[PDB]
Design a protein around this ligand. Structure first.
Ligand SMILES: O[C@@H]1[C@@H](O)[C@H](O[C@@H]2CO[C@@H](O[C@@H]3CO[C@@H](O)[C@H](O)[C@H]3O)[C@H](O)[C@H]2O)OC[C@H]1O
Ligand SMILES: O[C@@H]1[C@@H](O)[C@H](O[C@@H]2CO[C@@H](O[C@@H]3CO[C@@H](O)[C@H](O)[C@H]3O)[C@H](O)[C@H]2O)OC[C@H]1O
Ligand SMILES: O[C@@H]1[C@@H](O)[C@H](O[C@@H]2CO[C@@H](O[C@@H]3CO[C@H](O)[C@H](O)[C@H]3O)[C@H](O)[C@H]2O)OC[C@H]1O
Ligand SMILES: *[C@@H]1O[C@H](CO)[C@@H](O)[C@H](O)[C@H]1NC(C)=O
Ligand SMILES: O[C@@H]1[C@@H](O)[C@H](O)OC[C@H]1O
Ligand SMILES: [Cl-]
Ligand SMILES: [Cl-]
Ligand SMILES: [Cl-]
Ligand SMILES: [Cl-]
Ligand SMILES: [Cl-]
Ligand SMILES: [Cu+2]
Length: 235
């Protein structure tokens, strides 16, 4: 159970974005139905009044929280991967439009899942803004909590993989458009019951055997990290 408070650009807090530049749902409940339109940008997908300005090559940091800003972020039970996607705003997220910029599942060296490191990072994870065409974009940050993902929602609606999905409105101002944005995948649609990484038992299968759901990260992506960039308690 987690939500996005706002974003930082190049280590600078953009301020509370909830219902302003983030298409915030009413609460931190997960999405679990893979075929629901809620998979696109969560349960209240509508245009919000502002878009955060960035340039290609900037560091865009999402900041998650559980109940209040910079708290325990997400229950420690909710082990799983994190991904970030981008789509043109004109799509409203519909169609084969979502391109993956970032994926982190399990770090074998540190023996930690992405969510575990997100807690340590005070809810902060980042992507580098790609060199796509200037314009309006949706960045879709997705956490998949796998604590009940041994079951499929479609079979047992009281269990299943849990998706915490947030879409931020981002405007890319300056970019040389060196890597034009390609086709992507649909949400809902990309993930189905037989997709790798959707049904998995984290208690008895080694985490080193986990494979995150496709699609693969786009070759044009510039990287990203789960790491604190700024201190929320100073502001
Ligand atoms: O010891 C292991 C068991 O714990 C495991 O069972 C799962 C434990 O986590 C359960 O999900 C909880 C739902 O309520 C949330 O508030 C909690 O944070 C979650 O932990 C899940 O439903 C159980 O299946 O089975 C394997 C054992 O090794
Ligand atoms: O799959 C279901 C589980 O997710 C459910 O576990 C409970 C889910 O709600 C948890 O309470 C939330 C904690 O965070 C607060 O901000 C929210 O307002 C609360 O809703 C609760 O602790 C879990 O036990 O159990 C039932 C399963 O079907
Ligand atoms: O537990 C499962 C139910 O939760 C599931 O019911 C969904 C409840 O939410 C509905 O969408 C709302 C419709 O009205 C507005 O658009 C709201 O904003 C939406 O949240 C879904 O359509 C239901 O499917 O049904 C199955 C049950 O097992
Ligand atoms: C999943 O979502 C689809 C699309 O809205 C809906 O028709 C179906 O009833 C949902 N299933 C469940 C189990 O909630
Ligand atoms: O579940 C809802 C669905 O029924 C509606 O058609 O689109 C919005 C969703 O939240
Ligand atoms: Cl708050
Ligand atoms: Cl950190
Ligand atoms: Cl550039
Ligand atoms: Cl498994
Ligand atoms: Cl980064
Ligand atoms: Cu939760």
């Amino acid at each position: 159970h987690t939500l996005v408070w706002g974003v930082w650009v190049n280590g600078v807090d953009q301020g509370d974005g909830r219902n302003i530049y983030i298409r915030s749902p009413p609460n931190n409940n997960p999405v679990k139905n893979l075929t629901s339109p809620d998979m696109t940008c969560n349960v209240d997908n509508r245009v919000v009044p502002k878009s955060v300005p960035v340039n290609a090559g900037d560091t865009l940091t999402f900041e998650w929280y559980h109940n209040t800003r910079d708290d325990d972020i997400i229950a420690s039970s909710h082990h799983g991967p994190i991904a970030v996607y981008i789509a043109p705003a004109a799509s409203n997220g519909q169609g084969n439009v979502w391109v993956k910029l970032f994926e982190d599942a399990y770090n074998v060296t540190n023996s930690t899942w992405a969510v575990d490191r997100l807690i340590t990072a005070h809810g902060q994870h980042s992507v580098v803004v790609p060199h796509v065409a200037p314009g309006d974009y949706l960045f879709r940050a997705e956490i998949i909590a796998l604590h009940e993902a041994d079951s499929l929602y479609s079979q047992n609606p009281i269990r299943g993989a849990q998706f915490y999905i947030s879409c931020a409105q981002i405007t890319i101002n300056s970019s040389d458009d060196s890597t034009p944005l390609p086709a992507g995948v649909p949400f809902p649609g990309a993930y189905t019951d037989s997709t790798p990484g959707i049904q998995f038992n984290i208690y008895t299968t080694p985490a080193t055997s986990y494979v995150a759901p496709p699609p693969s990260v786009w070759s044009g992506a510039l990287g990203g990290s789960i790491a604190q960039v700024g201190d929320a308690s100073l502001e």
